[PDB]
């Protein structure tokens, strides 16, 4: 079968912080993106949908930075909250490298997805 995993630590004494209010919260966990339905090879010019979700998403309104790699760049905020798919159409065929960055007042999570788009060739 197939499965993923993660792991990273980040803690330091109270040296500095850009916050004027102490509120109870927790960092992001189990953050990753997925493509609508298991697809093998998509054709060029077909808008692709990216489904994002979280395991606990306890953290508050967090920021999200999606990197298409093909010059396209967008900055979404509270993606999980809005639970809205990310549409994106390609022009030329070729495996693309997608990534995401999440950093909230509590913690920060990141993920990377690989997309493949083959031309009109058989298959």
Domain enclosing residue 116, as ranges = 25-123
Beta-carbon neighbour count of residue 84 at 10 Å? 13
In whole angstroms, give the CA distance from residue 78 to residue 65: 10
In a domain, 117, yes or no: yes
Calculated CA dihedral for residues 2, 7, 109, 113, nearest 10 degrees: -30
Helix (H, G, I), strand (E, B) or coil at 9: coil
Beta-carbon neighbour count of residue 100 at 10 Å? 21
Tokens of 107: 């913690």
In whole angstroms, give the CA distance from residue 79 to residue 102: 10
Q: Determine if residue 102 is left, alpha or beta; phi over 0 gives left, psi from -120 to 50 gives alpha, anything else beta.
A: beta
In a domain, 101, yes or no: yes
Structure method? NMR
CATH of the domain at 35: 2.60.40.10
């Amino acid at each position: 079968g197939s499965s993923g995993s993660s792991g990273c630590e980040g803690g330091v004494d109270m040296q500095q912080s850009q916050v004027q209010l102490q509120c109870p919260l927790t960092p992001p966990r189990g953050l990753q993106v997925s493509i609508q339905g298991e697809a093998v090879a998509v054709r060029p010019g077909e808008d692709v949908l990216f489904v994002v979700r979280q395991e606990q998403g306890d953290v508050l309104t967090t920021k999200y930075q999606v990197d298409l790699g093909d010059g396209f760049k967008a900055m979404y905020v509270n993606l999980t909250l809005t639970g809205e798919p990310i549409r994106h159409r390609y022009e030329s065929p070729g495996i693309y490298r997608v990534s995401v960055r999440a950093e909230n007042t509590a913690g920060h999570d990141e993920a990377v997805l690989f997309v493949q788009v083959s031309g009109p060739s058989s298959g």
